[PDB]
Write a protein that binds this ligand. Structure first.
Ligand SMILES: *[C@@H]1O[C@H](CO)[C@@H](O[C@@H]2O[C@H](CO)[C@@H](O[C@@H]3O[C@H](CO[C@H]4O[C@H](CO[C@H]5O[C@H](CO)[C@@H](O)[C@H](O)[C@@H]5O)[C@@H](O)[C@H](O[C@H]5O[C@H](CO)[C@@H](O)[C@H](O)[C@@H]5O)[C@@H]4O)[C@@H](O)[C@H](O[C@H]4O[C@H](CO)[C@@H](O)[C@H](O)[C@@H]4O[C@H]4O[C@H](CO)[C@@H](O)[C@H](O)[C@@H]4O[C@H]4O[C@H](CO)[C@@H](O)[C@H](O)[C@@H]4O)[C@@H]3O)[C@H](O)[C@H]2NC(C)=O)[C@H](O)[C@H]1NC(C)=O
Ligand SMILES: *[C@@H]1O[C@H](CO)[C@@H](O[C@@H]2O[C@H](CO)[C@@H](O[C@@H]3O[C@H](CO)[C@@H](O)[C@H](O[C@H]4O[C@H](CO)[C@@H](O)[C@H](O)[C@@H]4O)[C@@H]3O)[C@H](O)[C@H]2NC(C)=O)[C@H](O)[C@H]1NC(C)=O
Ligand SMILES: *[C@@H]1O[C@H](CO)[C@@H](O[C@@H]2O[C@H](CO)[C@@H](O)[C@H](O)[C@H]2NC(C)=O)[C@H](O)[C@H]1NC(C)=O
Ligand SMILES: *[C@@H]1O[C@H](CO)[C@@H](O[C@@H]2O[C@H](CO)[C@@H](O)[C@H](O)[C@H]2NC(C)=O)[C@H](O)[C@H]1NC(C)=O
Ligand SMILES: *[C@@H]1O[C@H](CO)[C@@H](O[C@@H]2O[C@H](CO)[C@@H](O)[C@H](O)[C@H]2NC(C)=O)[C@H](O)[C@H]1NC(C)=O
Ligand SMILES: *[C@@H]1O[C@H](CO)[C@@H](O[C@@H]2O[C@H](CO)[C@@H](O)[C@H](O)[C@H]2NC(C)=O)[C@H](O)[C@H]1NC(C)=O
Lengths: 53, 96, 105, 132, 113
């Protein structure tokens, strides 16, 4: 299985207090795409046949 | 090492040491958080607008661009800073 | 907006906002007194009828400006260029990009 | 060989529905998409809108209420109708055949693609010169 | 069980110069009680019954001259030759005798190039 977030993010530091840092999201560099995963169709059908067997 | 001519009955369901591993991984998950930072000053009113994007009215943006007052390192001055959050992490409190 | 080089030289013509997502820039040119003519319809493609060396920008690049690289210019190419970008993040631009003219020596 | 042929009044009176028709040259009105594009004097053009049969009726968000693009398939012409001519409407107007495409940057099943539109041919012109 | 994996499959060299061979184990064979380690390096000729070369993972057998050296402890082991002979160019083996089942190595067939 392959899994990805293709969005290129920018970590931005925000100073809360003395020695206190909050790491927020800055810019979305590029396209706004949806995170997803891939499995192989054929081997998943194969393993489902095995588990039904 | 292998043991010859021996037979023991096992049971993974009434087994111990899955209880021990569950308790130890929970407690060890907790113990790596005591040096970390509490978000006490971040529970604050978030003025959230949509992310800069071609908005489709049928679908929804899964990111909100939220600006808020943040306390600075000085206890006198506060600043205005923005961030990006997901829909699943913010809720609207009841125009503006 | 003008680009003044000798006829037969290199020229670039930038037009519009810096890129945000995956663009699809479309370039036109305006002859005076006539309706326009397309020159570029994809990021770096060209149709039949217009010759080469209208080298567009790669519109799959983030945080850049849509150029129009024209090497070996001539007086027959003299028109008013127009970018018309299709940014994936920004919405549909119904007006074209501003008139980026060309004069030749 | 494909060109175009506009037709309109030329001398334009305000507070009046405006009309334009676009003749064809070889290419019939049924097949391809259509578009109207206006341009003032010394300005960048303003694409009025693309129209076609079967629901392809997407217009400019500048107007949205006072323009009507359609065809004339009995005569093999294209029709534009306008409402409320003002001083900004003094511009030369163009018909065009447009075409489309796809620009893909992610998973196609996640609707991560958009359609561009390009006008490869262009019209000849009709001047909407407002005068009262 | 315990997997004994020899790292090369063959080694065709010239005669006279030294070589070296390795056997990795899937399990640390170093007996903590005896502080001594469990490899049998064997030598099988073509069509012959094998013989021991190295016992206790380091010590040569009687009848074997000084030109062999079993070396290394822990999990990865090395048989280093100092001078190749014509009597030596056949298959070597590594064996764990730490547990049942007694598993051998793959067998590195050393011949003359
Ligand atoms: C999990 O699984 C899912 C699916 O199961 C995966 O999801 C997939 O994810 C990938 C990447 O994340 C997506 O890829 C994009 O695909 C589009 C569409 O590709 C097709 O269309 C292209 C253009 O079509 C034209 O040509 C074809 C001929 O093939 C013709 O039939 C058609 O009518 C039209 O005329 C084709 O080029 C492309 O073919 C390419 O790939 C083939 C693969 O084997 C190969 O055989 C071909 O020879 C060719 O190499 C395919 O048919 C792509 O267009 C897109 O690529 C652009 O966008 C990215 C991001 O913006 C950019 O980085 C790329 O560089 C590229 O941008 C160039 O091309 C644009 C085309 O207009 C151009 O506008 C740009 O300016 C830029 O142009 C520059 O380079 C080109 C040459 O590349 C040059 O000509 C220019 O001058 C300029 O220099 C992406 O690759 C999939 O869509 C998506 N979904 C599916 C169903 O696959 C997911 O990734 C998996 N996840 C994991 C973790 O595994
Ligand atoms: C930015 O996002 C906007 C979304 O707001 C997006 O606009 C959409 O563009 C497409 C074409 O570019 C418009 O047309 C659609 O195209 C498909 C393909 O032919 C048609 O099948 C659609 O018809 C259906 O929907 C109609 C109603 O819209 C129905 O009348 C019809 O019977 C079909 O059910 C449709 O015509 C699409 O309408 C707009 N969206 C809106 C809301 O107007 C734009 O392309 C994006 N731009 C960029 C650069 O990303
Ligand atoms: C999951 O990702 C791996 C890469 O980590 C893919 O394996 C590659 O597949 C391509 C062919 O599609 C080969 O050319 C590469 O050599 C492979 N690389 C590796 C490291 O194996 C795999 O195909 C992906 N599977 C799915 C279902 O997307
Ligand atoms: C999130 O919103 C902030 C505003 O709170 C945006 O920041 C401004 O962006 C404009 C457009 O370029 C600039 O002119 C301003 O100077 C920016 N202000 C600050 C304080 O940075 C920001 O661009 C938005 N980001 C996203 C991803 O939507
Ligand atoms: C900004 O986000 C708001 C939501 O807080 C959008 O308002 C509604 O969004 C849904 C789906 O995005 C649409 O179906 C509704 O029609 C929207 N409401 C209205 C009154 O239009 C809003 O559209 C987003 N965009 C802008 C530009 O404000
Ligand atoms: C950040 O703090 C400022 C100042 O405390 C807030 O701005 C005030 O907002 C209220 C409500 O709209 C107004 O009545 C005040 O006049 C504003 N004061 C100033 C100085 O502008 C602001 O709402 C806070 N949050 C953000 C996101 O900026």
């Amino acid at each position: 299985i392959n899994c990805t977030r293709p969005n290129n993010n920018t970590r931005k530091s925000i100073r809360i207090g003395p020695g206190q840092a909050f790491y927020a999201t800055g810019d979305i560099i590029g396209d706004i795409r949806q995170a997803h995963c891939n499995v192989s169709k054929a081997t998943w059908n194969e393993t489902l046949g095995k588990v039904v067997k | 090492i292998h043991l010859e001519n021996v037979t023991e009955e096992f049971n993974m369901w009434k087994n111990n040491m899955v209880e021990q591993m569950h308790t130890d991984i929970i407690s060890l998950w907790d113990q790596s958080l005591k040096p970390c930072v509490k978000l006490t000053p971040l529970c604050v009113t978030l003025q959230c607008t949509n992310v800069t994007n071609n908005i489709t009215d049928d679908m929804r943006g899964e990111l909100k661009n939220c600006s808020f007052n943040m306390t600075t390192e000085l206890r006198d001055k506060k600043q205005k800073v923005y961030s990006l959050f997901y829909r699943l992490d913010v809720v609207q409190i009841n125009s503006n | 907006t003008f680009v003044s080089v000798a006829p037969g030289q290199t020229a670039r013509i930038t037009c519009g906002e810096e890129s945000l997502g995956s663009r699809s820039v479309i370039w036109y040119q305006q002859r005076p007194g006539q309706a326009p003519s397309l020159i570029i319809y994809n990021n770096n493609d060209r149709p039949s009828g217009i010759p080469d060396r209208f080298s567009g920008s790669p519109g799959s690049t983030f945080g850049t400006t849509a150029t129009l690289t024209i090497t070996s210019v001539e007086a027959g190419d003299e028109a008013d260029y127009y970018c018309h970008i299709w940014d994936s993040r920004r919405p549909t631009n119904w007006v074209f990009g501003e008139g980026t003219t060309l004069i030749v020596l | 060989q494909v060109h175009l042929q506009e037709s309109g009044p030329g001398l334009v009176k305000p507070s009046e529905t405006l009309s334009l028709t676009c003749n064809v040259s070889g290419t019939l009105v049924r097949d391809n998409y259509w578009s109207w594009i206006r341009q003032p004097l010394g300005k960048q053009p303003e694409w009025i809108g693309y129209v076609h049969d079967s629901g392809d009726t997407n217009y400019n968000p500048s107007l949205k209420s006072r323009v009507h693009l359609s065809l004339d398939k009995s005569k093999n012409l294209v029709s534009l109708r306008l409402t409320g001519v003002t001083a900004a409407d003094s511009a030369i107007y163009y018909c065009a055949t447009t075409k489309h495409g796809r620009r893909i940057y992610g998973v196609v099943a996640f609707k991560e693609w958009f359609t561009y539109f390009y006008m490869d041919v262009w019209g000849k012109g009709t001047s909407v010169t407002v005068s009262s | 069980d315990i997997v004994m994996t020899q790292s090369p499959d063959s080694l065709a060299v010239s005669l006279g110069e030294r070589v070296t061979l390795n056997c990795k184990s899937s399990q640390s064979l170093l007996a903590s009680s005896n502080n001594k380690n469990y490899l049998a390096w064997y030598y099988q000729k073509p069509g012959q019954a094998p013989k021991l070369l190295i016992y206790w993972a380091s010590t040569r057998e009687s009848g074997v001259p000084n030109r062999f050296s079993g070396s290394g402890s822990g999990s990865d082991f090395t048989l280093t030759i100092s001078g190749l002979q014509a009597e030596d160019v056949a298959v070597y083996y590594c064996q764990q005798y730490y547990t049942t089942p007694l598993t051998f190595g793959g067998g590195t067939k050393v011949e003359i190039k």
